[PDB]
From a paper:
Talin rod domain–containing protein 1 (TLNRD1) shares 22% homology with the talin R7R8 rod domains, and is highly conserved throughout vertebrate evolution, although little is known about its function. Here we show that TLNRD1 is an α-helical protein structurally homologous to talin R7R8. Like talin R7R8, TLNRD1 binds F-actin, but because it forms a novel antiparallel dimer, it also bundles F-actin. Increasing TLNRD1 expression enhances filopodia formation and cell migration on 2D substrates, while TLNRD1 down-regulation has the opposite effect. Together, our results suggest that TLNRD1 has retained the diverse interactions of talin R7R8, but has developed distinct functionality as an actin-bundling protein that promotes filopodia assembly.
To determine the extent of the structural similarity between TLNRD1 and talin R7R8, we used x-ray crystallography to solve the structures of both full-length TLNRD1 (TLNRD1-FL) and the four-helix domain (TLNRD1-4H). This confirmed that TLNRD1 consists of a nine-helix module comprised of a four-helix and five-helix bundle connected via the same unusual domain linkage identified in talin R7R8, where the four-helix bundle (R8) is inserted into a loop between helices α3 and α4 of the five-helix bundle (R7). The first 40 residues of TLNRD1-FL are not visible in the density, supporting the secondary structure prediction that the N-terminal region is unstructured. The TLNRD1 structures reveal the basis for TLNRD1 dimerization, which is mediated by a novel interface on the four-helix bundle. In both the TLNRD1-FL and TLNRD1-4H structures, the four-helix bundle forms an extensive interaction with a four-helix bundle of a second TLNRD1 molecule. An identical dimer interface was observed in both the TLNRD1-FL and the TLNRD1-4H structures, which crystallized in different space groups. However, the structure of TLNRD1 revealed that the putative actin-binding surfaces on α2 and α3 are positioned facing away from the dimer interface, raising the possibility that TLNRD1 might engage two actin filaments simultaneously, and thus cross-link and bundle actin. However, a notable feature of the TLNRD1-FL structure is that the five-helix bundle packs against the side of the four-helix bundle. Thus, it is possible that this more compact conformation might represent an autoinhibited conformation of TLNRD1, rendering some binding sites cryptic. The structural information from equivalent talin complexes was used to model the RIAM- and KANK-binding sites onto the TLNRD1-FL structure.
Numbering used by the authors:
A (entry chain A): 40 to 343
B (entry chain B): 39 to 342
Write the structure that this text describes.
Amino acid sequence: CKGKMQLVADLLLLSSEARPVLFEGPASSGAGAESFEQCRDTIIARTKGLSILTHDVQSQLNMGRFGEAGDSLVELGDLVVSLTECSAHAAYLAAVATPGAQPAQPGLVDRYRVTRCRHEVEQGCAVLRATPLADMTPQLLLEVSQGLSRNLKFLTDACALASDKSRDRFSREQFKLGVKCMSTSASALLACVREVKVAPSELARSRCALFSGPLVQAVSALVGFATEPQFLGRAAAVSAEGKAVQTAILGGAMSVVSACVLLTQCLRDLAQHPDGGAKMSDHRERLRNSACAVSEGCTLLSQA
Amino acid sequence: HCKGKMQLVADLLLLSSEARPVLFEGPASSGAGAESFEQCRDTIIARTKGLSILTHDVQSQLNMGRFGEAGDSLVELGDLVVSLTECSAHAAYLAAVATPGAQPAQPGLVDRYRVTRCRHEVEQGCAVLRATPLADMTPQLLLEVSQGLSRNLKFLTDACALASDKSRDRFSREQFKLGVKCMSTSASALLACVREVKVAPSELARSRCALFSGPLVQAVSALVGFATEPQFLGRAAAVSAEGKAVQTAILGGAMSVVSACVLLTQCLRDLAQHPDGGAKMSDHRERLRNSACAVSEGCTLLSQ
């Protein structure tokens, strides 16, 4: 049951390390219709939440309340994710607010989001593959099936929009065909997930693994097609000052993420021999690291 | 180039005729749909005659240097050997079950041999779409690939429809349908790309065709994999030792024929480098021998 904490202090780590796909590259709006000031306020809120959750998870671990610590981590991960996205967006807005800037131009789809969705679909199917039978509980399968259901819902909407925005016949129809393929694959798999749920057996499980391939491939093909170079639009064109302004904020946000990562590993570290815990300083140092990182983050938002 | 066009055939033929030996190893099942032993034997006689003819034809046509003709002769030889193989297998089954204490085979929801072949051919087609460089992707090759895939997919669809009907399980009954839907949508998605790379050739379109190949292969693999689950497979015939002997004989003879024609293919393949200076016309002549004698064995083990 303490294992359930190593789990989180890992899926969380990867969840928050994946998001640094916004911290390296060009300048694009990392969000949907918000202004810089509001965004910075959001970041402030997140950092507050971060202080709170840092303390909470710390004390909850040091109490021996692992089940709570886990959820606290989950929330911390989600919070760091949000903070990262907002940081990226604020960096972009600050960048384009600069004198001679030209704004970015949207692709047919949001690359970052669909990339995330592909990653999540692959993760879900991986979970269906790597889970042993008796461990495939009716709740786990429902969670996986629900996660696949959102991801597919988002991809479907995105590709619908992309189809609409397309002014070429082939692309317009290809998006639709790809969507149909994706949906049928999904249905086929989810049937198997329901079957292995109601009538568990090794056959049904291997079946669930069998019908995972078509969905992963479908989504990979659709996303691959959706991100063809001519569909990608354009990153913003900004002066050196803009890029500096953006680099700063991205730096701070990266500081936060890295600090929280080190904290996560430190949480995972003591989850073997807690009573002994010869490494009590390492854990405590990351509260500080995170706090200072948050300070940098706040520093580069008020100045630029 | 035109002798170049012959490596292709003297290879796809070999694999086409070596793949069909999926009827030459295993248990005893009807390898055809509703024919009697005598008629089957007659068919085999006809095939062997045709085989003698085509043996000569391809031999002389090569030794004349008329390669384009030799190629087509090979193709027809391949098709003929395939037919002979199927008939031989069926005759072996019929002879086996004609034995005193035999119990006949019982059909699975689908014909394993055919769907296996179809999966193999879909994979082959998609492989061809992947490994062909642009401009070698001629408007005829794409049409050929497309029609092949369409032919295999039509068969798979009909078979799985029948399987859905014959199913006595709700889940299986529905799963066949879902799998078919998935297969068809994937197919459509891919064939669209095949049409695009044909009308508007480019590297993008080509890589696209390769991109949209995965979902179809996986769809077919999942559907075929599911269709051949152990509880769907039915039963092989239960025959005495004499029956099995009787079958072993015929399968042996037919295997002799196939192996001989394989070696002949290789001998034809051998001389397509230095025809003017090829000391091994004897290797080539010997396979006439092997094939003829093999045909004799085949006929021998058919009379009893």
